Write a protein that binds this ligand. Structure first.
Ligand SMILES: Cc1ccc2c(c1)sc(-c1ccc(N(C)C)cc1)[n+]2C
Ligand SMILES: Cc1ccc2c(c1)sc(-c1ccc(N(C)C)cc1)[n+]2C
Ligand SMILES: Cc1ccc2c(c1)sc(-c1ccc(N(C)C)cc1)[n+]2C
Lengths: 100, 99
């Protein structure tokens, strides 16, 4: 079927509290074809030790996938998600918007 | 960097004609990820199948399982049809009852 471009959402598991351990998630949804690269970024730099869900799909072959890592937020630190996919020219970055 | 799937077909318990079992097609070790899988009662594509999710290694080798509840009979015969890029022609694999 026809190509389609991922929806990308970045969120913490519990609400932020500086210096308290949390998890950071990057949820990539709705996309096709399946092949995709995902990386999480502490101040523009690629976190080593990340974990991920399996890659699941609908009857209509939309794919869904989750990346996450334990982390401790601080006032100075800035976190984001870098996705590359065919439907993206340029690897797309999306910031973690704290204030929600 | 391409890799062709390993394909294994097996029942969960040993065959017993007219007793309910599960049939699995396990497709392993493959890349890239895109792949079609179907199970076949006498060459015909079974409607109501289930599947695991698609998991992968650090290596980006992918792993996936299809299965269905079924009742085997002496004359019935079952198989798995996989299509992948690395295959010229969709590959079929039989279920050997005497696994
Ligand atoms: C079925 C299910 C289970 C969990 C679950 C969802 C759906 S959807 C979701 C979630 C998605 C996005 C966000 N942010 C972008 C703030 C926060 C939470 N969770 C955590
Ligand atoms: C319409 C439709 C069909 C299937 C389907 C969805 C939507 S959304 C989804 C899904 C699967 C796994 C995950 N995580 C790994 C947490 C999150 C979402 N599935 C499996
Ligand atoms: C009755 C009977 C006899 C042999 C037999 C089975 C049932 S089920 C089975 C088997 C084959 C492959 C796998 N994996 C690759 C996960 C798991 C189990 N064997 C080898």
């Amino acid at each position: 079927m026809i190509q389609r471009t991922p929806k990308i959402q970045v969120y913490s598991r519990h609400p932020a509290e500086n210096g308290k351990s949390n998890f950071l998630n990057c949820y990539v949804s709705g996309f096709h074809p399946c092949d995709i690269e995902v990386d999480l970024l502490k101040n523009g730099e690629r976190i080593e030790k990340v974990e991920h869900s399996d890659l699941s799909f609908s009857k209509d072959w939309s794919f869904y996938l989750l990346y996450y890592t334990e982390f401790t937020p601080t006032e100075k630190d800035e976190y984001a998600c870098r996705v590359n996919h065919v439907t993206l020219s340029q690897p797309k970055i999306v910031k973690w918007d704290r204030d929600m």
